[PDB]
């Protein structure tokens with residue numbers, strides 16, 4: 001993925017557990033060569049998955065748990081490293097936000113013009129709840145979507161209850177979630 | 183499950199959408215031959231599954247969204263229908279309360295001779311985080327655990343974020359939840 005993402009992980013790790021750690025992880029994930037990530041340059045997803053795996057081992061935490069925290073972080077990190085106005089333009093409620101998210105990523109993608117955004121379709125089951133459809137060219141990131149989702153809860157002082165009901169990894173067509181919100 | 187599980191479902195639906203809706207929902211579950219649920223009486227689990235499945239059709243929500251709801255509602259309903267004090271006795275805080283859960287359901291089991299209760303194990307990540315291990319003889323109730331915890335959050339004036347990191351029905355040994363709390 002574009003190196004913003006890996007910068008993102010490096011800085012979450014760095015803020016939380018120090019630099020020492022980041023570097024072991026960066027070494028473990030087999031990436032010591034690279035001296036910094038280039039925010040607007042593209043990488044092989046490999047780079048991102050190995051980072052996550054290293055992080056797990058060094059930190060002794062489930063990969064899934066790091067994805068979840070990473071999803072939460074990103075929401076704050078984007079609003080702060082040059083995308084806060086774009087974020088805000090995507091709306092000021094969670095449901096509105098989730099409808100604008102493909103357009104959000106579309107705006108982004110005309111700058112990062114090699115972007116492989118995900119797709120998100122909402123089916124509202126009420127004014128407090130929906131089925132969310134997560135469609136992706138990649139595997140493994142559902143847990144990120146949950147962190148992401150709780151992060152947007154914070155941003156909007158909204159309380160979000162989230163549960164996966166369908167699973168790409170098992171060969172189903174895409175990930176689906178049921179979401180209850182304040 | 184024991185009848186009060188079912189009275190509680192009935193109660194919720196009825197309070198939230200009236201008795202015609204509820205009647206309808208009963209009929210659809212193929213339980214017209216039942217004028218009332220007997221709280222302290224053991225029913226086949228089918229009754230409960232059927233009722234949820236039937237209530238998904240009639241309200242146009244997924245089961246899983248209802249289970250989240252039911253999970254929330256259970257917490258209030260029990261404090262009002264004869265288990266207020268057993269609840270208090272379980273603790274003044276969420277972590278504490280979950281730690282006590284196997285102990286609470288044991289106490290319930292005195293009274294409920296053939297109870298088949300869940301088993302909850304807590305690993306404490308931090309003063310404000312836990313891994314919840316949820317183990318069960320039954321399938322499909324993880325969404326409820328999620329609702330349950332939100333109700334507990336409400337009870338103890340505590341904001342909570344629950345993320346399920348592992349899933350009994352893709353073949354994993356048991357549901358594991360990552361949790362973060364005030």
Ligand code: HEM
Nearest residue numbers: 001002078083087108115116117118136137138141148149
């Ligand atoms: C300022 C806000 C955002 C920016 C700049 C942004 C940008 C990006 C970028 C650059 C990627 C990597 C795609 C690639 O390299 O091909 C990505 C992936 C992703 N973004 Fe965002 N994004 C933002 C907000 C969000 C939000 C709020 C969500 C909420 C769910 C989200 C969900 C995702 C997901 C799930 C992926 C994974 C890629 C995949 O599934 O294929 N993004 N985003």
Ligand code: HEM
Nearest residue numbers: 183184260265269290297298299300318319320323327330
């Ligand atoms: C006064 C409080 C509570 C009472 C009296 C109670 C009682 C029961 C009863 C009677 C059942 C049905 C079991 C059976 O029929 O064999 C049950 C199931 C369950 N209870 Fe509780 N419970 C209480 C609080 C909680 C809380 C706070 C949770 C939080 C997560 C919880 C989680 C569960 C779960 C997950 C089941 C599902 C059954 C299964 O997985 O096999 N309970 N409980």
